[PDB]
Each structure stands twice: as C-alpha cells, then as structure tokens.
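A reminder before we start the practical. When you read a complex entry, don't treat the lines as separate problems. The point of joint prediction is that each chain is placed relative to the others, so the output describes one connected object in space. Small molecules and nucleic acid strands, if listed, are placed in the same frame. In the example below there are three entries. Take a minute to note the order of the lines before looking further.
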Amino acid sequence: MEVDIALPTLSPGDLSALQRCEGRVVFLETLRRHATLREVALPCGGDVLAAMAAYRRRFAAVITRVTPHRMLATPLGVGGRGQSLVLQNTGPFDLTNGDHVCLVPPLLGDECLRLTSANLELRFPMTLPLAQARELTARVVARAAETLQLPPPHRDNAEAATRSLVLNMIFLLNEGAVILLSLIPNLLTLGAQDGYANAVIQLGSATRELGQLVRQPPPPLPQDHARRFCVFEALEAWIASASRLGDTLGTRPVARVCIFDGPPTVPPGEKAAVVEV
Amino acid sequence: IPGSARHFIAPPFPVGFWARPGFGEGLDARLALAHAN
Amino acid sequence: RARLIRQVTLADFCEPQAERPGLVVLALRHPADLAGAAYAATPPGKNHRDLEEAWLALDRASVVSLNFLVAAAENADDALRAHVTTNYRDRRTAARLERFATVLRAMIRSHVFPHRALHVLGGLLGHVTQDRLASVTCVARGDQEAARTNDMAARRSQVHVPACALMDVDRELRLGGDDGLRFAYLVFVYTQRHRREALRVHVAVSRLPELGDALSFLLAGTRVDNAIHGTDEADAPAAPAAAAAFPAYLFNDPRSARCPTGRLNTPAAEALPVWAPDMRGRATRNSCMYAAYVRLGTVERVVRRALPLAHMERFTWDVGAWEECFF
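Here is the predicted structure of the whole assembly.
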C-alpha cells in the first residue's frame, strides 16, 4: 500500500521548497489509498502535551516523492516490520547507529512549512533518539504536574496527563509493596558498604531523605501468608507496569536506524536509512 | 452505574410536596365501650 | 505468500470436519502449570484448590476453535449453541461444553485469567483426521487467501466470525469517521463477584491503534461494579490508625529530628515519628482487572450473511501480544 496525497495548484515558489521535504513524516487520519493535502494539516505551534496526545490516535506516514501534481507516501506501520526506507533527521540532536527513534512534536514553533496557494500550513514533527525522548516526555509531564525554550501549558488536557500518571502510580501500591518499603533503612545500610550500591541510589533520590526521618514497625503478616508470597507478584506487577509506562505518556518507538556504508553518525538535516519495527 | 441494575424511583414533584405520614381516626376505642355499655 | 502452522492434536474442542475452513483457532496451555500457579495465585479468603477440581472434572487436547469457545460464555445467541450441539459429531459434547464453562468461571475466580491460558493462532484451512485424532493447519502471517485448501470447490477461503459476538467500535463510539483500513482485536471481558461471575467474549474492529480509554469507557459498568465487589472475602482491619497518615510537613522543616546513616539499629534515635503504611484488603490491580485484548490483524470490510455469520474481507494475519485493561 502507498498513499497517494493529491495536491491542489501551487505557486511556483513554495512547490520548490516542498520538494525539499522528501523525508519528513505526516499524520493521516484514515488510511484510504487516495487523499488530499488539505486533510493532513496541523495548526500552528502550541500545546506540546495535547499534540503529543494526538499522535497516538492517528498513525504516521513518510513520503518519498513529490511530483508537481501528486505526493507519494508510505503507511508507516500497519503490516511492515522490515520495510526499509529513509527519513530526514529533523531534530536538534544527532542519531548514531542502532538506537531507536521516536516522534515528538516540534519545539518553540517557528518550524512550519506554510503554503500560500493552499492557505494551509504543516508541522512536521522532529525525530529524537528514544533515550532523550523519554527524558523530554518526563520533563514536560513533571512541569504539567505543577499546575495542579519553554512553552506554557493550558490546564485543559494537562489534567488528563496527570491522571494517566497518578493511575499507574496508585496501582503500584500493593500489599507486598509495603513489605519492600519496610527495608529502606536495611537498604541504605547496604548503600554505605559498597561503591556500586551507593551509585545505584542517586543524590536527589527522595528516599534517602526518608530513611533519616521516619521509623516503621515490622509489617503485619498478610491474610494467609503461609500459602502465597506477596513480594513476587508485587515485583511482577512492577516489571509489567514499568515496561509500558513511558508509552502511556510519550510515544512508542517507531524504527531503529541502521546503515551499511555511510558513516555511523548522521548530522541533522540529513537523510539517513532506516528499518522499521 | 453498570449491570442493567434497578434504580430507586424518586418522588417526581420536589421533595417538599409529599406529606409527612400520619393517621387520623377520631373513633376512640375506650370511650366507645363506655357508650355502648 | 503466507506461512502456516501444523499441530497434530485431539478432536476435543476444534473439530475441523464439522466447520468449514476460515475461522480462528486458539492454542491451549498445558493445564498442569495453570493448576500449579493457582496454588500461589488465588487471592486470600477464596478457595485455593477449586481449579484443581474443576480441571479434574473434565477427564493431548490442545486447540480450541473460537466457534466453540464463544458458546461456553455468557454472551451467545442460542442459535449458535444449537449449531455447536447438533452439528458437532462428537459424543458427550454438551456435557463437555458445560464443564468448560465451569473451568473458565473457576479460572477468573482463582485470579489466573484465561488470557494467560489461550494464545491465538491463525484461521484453519486443512486437516486430516483419524478416529478422534486430527492435524489442523492454520495460517500465521500474510493474508488468508494466499493459502490453498484441498476442498476443490473453493480453493481459497475467507475468515468467518460468529456475528453474535462481533462488536464494532467506531460506528458504536460515533467517531464520525469513514471506513478505510481498520484493525481487528479479540477482547475478553472479565467480571468478578464470588460464586456469581462470568466471562464475555467479543471481536472488535476499529481504526483505533490503542484501545485503552476506548474500552475503559465501553465497559464502564463492568469496571465500576468490579472495583467494589472485587475485594470481597478479604478481612480488612478496623478503622485505619492515624499513624498511617504519611507525614509530609516534615520534609523541608529546617528544625526537625534527624538521624544520619550508620546509627540505625536501636540507638538513642527513638525520637523519630512512627509511620505504618498498612495495606491489607484494599483493591489491588488484579482486583480491578476487567478486560484484556490482543491485536489480530487488519481488515477492509465486514458483511453479514448466512445461522448468522460475518465474513471478513482481505484479512491480513498479524498477531500481537496480550494486554491488560485494569485502570
């Protein structure tokens, strides 16, 4: 399948600039074979959180060729998991070999392709390595949680993000979680006997400031503790929930980059091959 | 909310318009015996 | 082309001569490890050997056709029960369906959910049968009609789903959308009330790549009445002590009792406030589990046409991993 984005008439000026958008990604809504430019069109900058929320409801599609009339595309992942393609790195970072990529809405605005004839604009999202897209999502969500190179939020849908966070954080508290919480001093006293252990516990860890303020009695034994053991399913719940935490807030990884001939690191504004997962 | 469960049917008119219950029967049982005697 | 799977098995639950090709089949876990994991998985208060008994009451057999499983649930239209009963050749079949119902109802009661007991294979196309021993063959990737059935009346096939269970979503949620290429999801619906519980099955199609909030709203009544009646039979203690209130006023107190590490056994550190987070009988996550889904593939069209059925259109088999739906 290859989506056919049709174009209205354009002034000879902006068509040439659109021609240089050979690797940026768009966001359709329905996956028909035919489509018109007016359909995929995002408003100007604003609401990084709402936009990030609106990237999981629609699916992506990268484009490969711009004739003076039509516009080829590629439905990113619906049935392909080895479909090699190319997309231009439009983020502020570099992306070395092997690391996965993720779609994140733009920053600061001012990165928007405006077409005079169609009277429309497009906001091609940037592509960051997963390891930093996670951190950016964390930062934006943390700042959103404070209204109970930075744009201010709206409080309209920031509450939805805080809700999605507090849900997963509440459902982590279980009857074995208290058991595991009981050993915080019994863990600190280990963190001062070895170097590695000390480095595993950060400085602003918000729990080192607990092991010095509060004392807790031994926890009460569960209802019928002799038959089942609670700490294990507590830890299993934690593993499963943390495996898909960032997904619930940010965006899933969409492709891992791999190059055979060219140099590994690719600078920004440069087209780099990729396989999708 | 769920389950196709039953609902408590409330008074249609506002709450102020359905009387506090009572029982009015001036027929007294004792003095009736005294008159029949 | 597409690639297939062959699994020899018993003619217990999926009976490839009784149905014609083109219907999804499921793989059933070995029951020994289910019965074992129960021993540690059933919650407090409830029974801890009732799944053992429920299984022993049904006596390798590995596959189960969805056409068979949908019958042994709450939701079903009795026409399909009649079809499965009178159209399956096999002996003692209705009794087995009853026992299987009891098995699944025990599974949810013991907090070992059937979605952790039924991986999904593709749609069967072929089979050779001895006396009560079959070898079904189903697709696993690619589109269904890349195969080649040995019927010689209809070489290719389609995918058939009992229309009684097919729940559409978009036209249901009224997204105002326009039908293009839509995904396909097989979803389970749990409900937990001790000795009064059941399981509902559905097959959902939509353009929504992430179900999540969509089911959370679709199954609102189930989640509601499941979060409150789910903790039942668990002895909760009396009113929680005031010491349970985790003190927050003490974090950025410049003047407060303090204790450096390395002097925490029983020193003159008795002055620290006590806090006993005590959580015994509250709603855990497995208590609020109400649904589970798994992606099946992509679909063009659904038409309804005959026993009622629902013929797919250009189904592309792409099986995904399971998913929880509790929040």
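Discuss with your neighbour: The longest helix of chain C spans residues 93-109. What might explain this?
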